[PDB]
Structure 1
Amino acid sequence: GFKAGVKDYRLTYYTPDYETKDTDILAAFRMTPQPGVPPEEAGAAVAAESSTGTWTTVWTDGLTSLDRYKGRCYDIEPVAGEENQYIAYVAYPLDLFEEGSVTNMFTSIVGNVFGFKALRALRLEDLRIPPAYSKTFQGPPHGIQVERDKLNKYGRPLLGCTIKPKLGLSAKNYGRAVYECLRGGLDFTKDDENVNSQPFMRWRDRFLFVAEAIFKSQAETGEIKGH
């Protein structure tokens, strides 16, 4: 039947006898329930409002199978040293995510459950990415070995420096201070986080002035340098 109305979350979203598969995503939460609420109700409400759920019953749920598209909470344990804090575990099916996108993964887990009126705190701790899901990404461009081979440097860690008048220098003076640091023995040199383009120093000439000094500082010692 239909029987429109309002029911609980635990009656459908709490299955503490479930065996995880090898193509599932797992997460761990830490929560502080609001006075007057059983821990299981909050643990079930966290999972329901993330995959498929609302505050009432709808008639369009009979046209599809809901036992292969839901999220489940299968474990609750209490923390040591407190009285109102617990740890919960959730499992998600594989086919709820889009291949090759990270923005879609974050939208389905930390989207809305962080502002419920029945909770006072929440924190995410860890995740488990299955090997069947990480093969659809590209990963780092080069890595580690391909980076050491290109620069021809083995044995010791690397070095670097950053120019530190944070803002206020011109272009020629900014380019001058790089030569005197690279000719000393360092390997790299860094810009700054808040330096893109400003009325005292534009980018298209800073690039040229840095490039001019890089070549000069390289032919005097005989080593590869960068910035």
Structure 2
Amino acid sequence: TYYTPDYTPKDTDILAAFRVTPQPGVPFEEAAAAVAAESSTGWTDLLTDLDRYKGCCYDIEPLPGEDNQFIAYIAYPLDLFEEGSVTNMLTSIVGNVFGFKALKALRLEDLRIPVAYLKTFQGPPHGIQVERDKLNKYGRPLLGCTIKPKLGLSAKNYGRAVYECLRGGLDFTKDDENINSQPFQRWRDRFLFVADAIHKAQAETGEIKGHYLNVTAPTCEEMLKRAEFAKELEMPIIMHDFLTAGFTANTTLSKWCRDNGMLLHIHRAMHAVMDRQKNHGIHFRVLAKCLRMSGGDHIHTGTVVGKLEGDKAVTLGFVDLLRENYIEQDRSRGIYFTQDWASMPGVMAVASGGIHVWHMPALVDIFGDDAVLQFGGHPWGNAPGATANRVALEACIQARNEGRDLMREGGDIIREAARWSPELAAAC
């Protein structure tokens, strides 16, 4: 009935891979059927053909080493899901099943979104290629700084920090995810002084500048009003906390961004509440695929610095899921299914958290060109710290292009550049 190991999934099915921990004494086959039943159909019964609405487990994969864990593969028919609705897809798949009593733990690791379902979504309002065309920036990662302190600066003092960062050679500055509108700093004052900072840095440098203005808000009306003011100020980019605001708000904003030409930077505040523990929750790569579908042009993907090679491979796995058109199944990188994105645009990976100039060669080597490297103190202040990072980046890119090995020659490349850049030198 719910466990059908002979079913072969259609190309239009949504597939889910759950890591299941059954309660002691529950056999794998019953846990697997339960997962499929509780995430689907669960006298009027014989008015309908319940066969065509059920999920089924088509495969149970034991996990060598793990204690009492296995992978259940579930298949869901296309017709269960509202077109264009990440909210309804999540509600359907993860709405119910995680509290079922015969399971001790449950983690959703991956989903195969079928092409026929993907075509019902807008996807990123812009995507990697269009974003570089609007910003005129080719052949390198983009650079951002976060402003510090997080909270407490007045709007005007905040803008001064943004100006100094930008004018040093960073492409972007960023609002903190906590900064929406607060007694110490109301949003409209911030938007206004930030726009002045961009205009001055853009005029002095001759390079397009931006700042991820946070429009995360209590209501959709208020979010859209913040977005419209950024538009009125001719800001190229804004920011949204997609998980704490929600996918309904995000999908609204993503369509609005597409309608208005605005780039959308997505911050993943709260993700570790669900995505951190190995036995329970939802893996980030699932939240990432959802975000690509609802829409964003950038997303935070975590850092790779000070991480084991296996954590690194997992991050690169989901970075490919965010950026590429076609990603082959590959369990050594946590890709459970082959994912075809059917020309839905890719999203830029944003690497941040604990990064400094000496990481630059590794960052460029690991991520390549299509990433934002988000830093956030130089001895001489904001503008010199920005120059130092910008010279370092350009040095690495030149070196790579010349055939130099960034993993082995990294410090050398940085040392050579430090010789003719005082700002970079001061940073060593």
Q: Distance in 1 between matches of 2:134 and 2:33?
A: 53
Q: 2:64 aligns with which of 80, 105, 109?
A: 80
Residue 38 of structure 2 aligns with which residue?
49
Identity among equivalent pairs (%): 90
Higher relative contact order (CA 8 A, sep 6+): 1
**Residue identity in the other structure for 2:7:** Y
Q: Distance in 2 between matches of 1:175 and 1:200?
A: 14
Residue 199 of structure 1 aligns with which residue?
183
**What are the residue-to-residue correspondences of 1:104-123 with 2, within 5 Å?**
104-123=88-107
**Residue identity in the other structure for 1:136:** T
Q: Distance in 1 between matches of 2:26 and 2:143?
A: 55
CA contact (8 A) 2:84 2:120 kept: yes
SS of aligned partner of 2:182: coil
SS of aligned partner of 1:13: coil
Paired residue total: 211
Shift of 1:119: 1.6
Q: Distance in 2 between matches of 1:89 and 1:195?
A: 41
Q: Distance in 1 between matches of 2:50 and 2:161?
A: 65
Q: 1:177 aligns with which of 134, 137, 161?
A: 161
1:165 partnered with 2:149 = yes
Residue 50 of structure 2 aligns with which residue?
66
Q: Distance in 2 between matches of 1:172 and 1:83?
A: 56
Shift of 1:155: 2.5
Change (3 A) 1:71 1:187: closer
1:15-56 Cα shifts (integer Å, max 9, x gaps): 222222222111112222222222212211221222212xxx
Q: Distance in 1 between matches of 2:40 and 2:72?
A: 16
**Residue identity in the other structure for 2:20:** M
SS of aligned partner of 2:137: coil
Q: Distance in 1 between matches of 2:201 and 2:67?
A: 63
CA contact (8 A) 2:38 2:100 kept: no
Q: Distance in 2 between matches of 1:18 and 1:206?
A: 56
Residue 28 of structure 1 aligns with which residue?
17
Q: Distance in 1 between matches of 2:68 and 2:201?
A: 62
> Please, which moves more after superposition, 197-206 or 126-135?
197-206
Residue 218 of structure 1 aligns with which residue?
202
Change (3 A) 1:184 1:135: same
TM-score w.r.t. structure 2 length?
0.46
Change (3 A) 1:105 1:195: same
Residue 103 of structure 1 aligns with which residue?
87
The root-mean-square deviation of aligned C-alpha atoms, in Å, is 1.8
Q: Distance in 1 between matches of 2:61 and 2:167?
A: 59
Change (3 A) 1:209 1:33: closer
Larger gyration radius, structure 1 or structure 2 = 1
Q: Distance in 1 between matches of 2:54 and 2:72?
A: 16
Structure 2 portions without partners, runs of 5+: 212-428
Q: Distance in 1 between matches of 2:165 and 2:133?
A: 24
Q: Distance in 1 between matches of 2:22 and 2:162?
A: 56
Residue 188 of structure 1 aligns with which residue?
172
> Please, which moves more after superposition, 94-103 or 23-32?
23-32
1:17 partnered with 2:6 = yes
Give the number of the structure whose residues are more often helix, by fraction: 2
SS of aligned partner of 2:143: coil
**Residue identity in the other structure for 1:92:** Y
Shift of 1:83: 4.5
Change (3 A) 1:212 1:77: closer
1:142 partnered with 2:126 = yes
**Residue identity in the other structure for 2:11:** D
Shift of 1:156: 2.3
SS of aligned partner of 1:108: helix
Change (3 A) 1:71 1:166: closer
SS of aligned partner of 1:68: helix
Residue 4 of structure 1 aligns with which residue?
none
Structure 1 portions without partners, runs of 5+: 1-11, 54-58
